[PDB]
């Protein structure tokens, strides 16, 4: 199809909750070579957000399982050869989307946060994969998503304001980074507090407790205005 | 595989929420060709009800869209495209149930419970198709959803207690079919009420009295729903 198609695709898709096909519209999207959009940007995006986060949902569920079942060696065997799929599937989805990093959108990126976007996604999907890899494998992964993210987050904090989603996005998942896979907890929480605590200051008349009470009374003021106009 | 490890991998599919991989283990172990335990039963009518209910839902989702689309006749023509491909992959499930109803399960049930629980099971599923059908199949396959109901129901009022669970399920599904599918709360108002009644008239153990009163209670919610219409 055309690009115009392929988007409107991927809109019903994500209506329907049909993920498979909305990463494979976005994907023809990606691959015919043009700089994304904001909008396809966000719907590549969701569509590998929730295709690969099934397949590590599954694997939780099935290592857990494997882990808690050693009275039966045949049960055992099973949930390692069914983990594996699960990984391979993994596996082939986090290079699919790697690659598509690779060859399209990092080097299209025009402005520095599509660039930050972009390179925050390679971090992500490299540690997605080093959560089931093994060996010398799985360091390079690591090294590979902590490289990403750095990079992400150099650019970040010289070109965004520290109120900008992407980059606090950014230091969401990095902070993640440092606590899930680096079990890093102290950096972990240093990085998402001082991102919080810069966005804060960026608002010039508010601080934390007056942050929370206005984003409050913001949200009923849109749900009395949703409610009212129906 | 044989069939301890097909039912193992079906159990750890639903686990993993992958009702792909759940349906096409117990579709192998249902082509072998034996009668089913209980729990064999249980994974085959659950892994296929969350295959086939994704696609009921991807369905209406779609056709509810394709109809609010107001002056955009691209958008609409790629939702009726879009709307037809999922009725094709909803079709192709229902066909592969049903086929695996009249080839293995119903001719090899030997136990008046399977049975019903079988024959139910083909009114759901020709129910499902006749939601999507065009033409001369939508008459058909009520007509086909109805006489399977129908046949389960001579089964289970001579075979089984009003409270047993697969005879109050069986009242649940094809009250909803008459609900649903033939627009008639009169017939679905009085099934439902009908077993309910003939239930707290009363024979059960702690699993079957657990599936038997969480039916009563979908009945009773049906009934409230439905008079109050």
Redesign the interface.
């Known amino acids: 199809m055309d690009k115009s ?1 392929l988007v ?2 991927a809109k ?2 994500e ?4 993920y498979d096909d909305m990463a494979a519209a976005m994907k023809a999207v990606t691959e015919q070579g043009h700089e994304l959009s904001n909008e396809e940007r966000n719907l590549l995006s969701v569509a590998y957000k929730n295709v690969v986060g ?1 397949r590590r ?2 694997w939780r ?2 290592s857990s ?1 494997e882990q808690k079942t050693e009275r039966n060696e ?2 055992q065997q ?2 390692k050869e ?1 983990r594996e799929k ?1 990984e391979a599937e993994l596996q082939d989805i986090c290079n699919d989307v790697l690659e598509l990093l690779d060859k399209y959108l990092i080097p299209n990126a025009t402005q520095p946060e599509s660039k930050v976007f972009y390179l925050k996604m390679k971090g992500d999907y490299f540690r997605y994969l080093s959560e089931v890899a093994s060996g010398d494998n799985k360091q390079t992964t690591v090294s590979n998503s902590q490289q990403a993210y750095q990079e992400a987050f150099e650019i970040s904090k010289k070109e965004m304001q520290p109120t900008h989603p992407i980059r606090l996005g950014l230091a969401l998942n990095f902070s993640v980074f440092y606590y899930e896979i680096l079990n890093s907890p102290e950096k972990a929480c240093s990085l998402a507090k001082t991102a919080f605590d810069e966005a804060i200051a960026e608002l010039d008349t508010l601080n934390e407790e007056s942050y929370k009470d206005s984003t409050l009374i913001m949200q009923l003021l849109r749900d009395n205005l949703t409610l009212w106009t129906s």
């Open positions: 198609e409107q695709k019903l898709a209506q329907a909750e049909r099934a949902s599954s569920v099935i399982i045949k049960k099973m949930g069914y699960i």
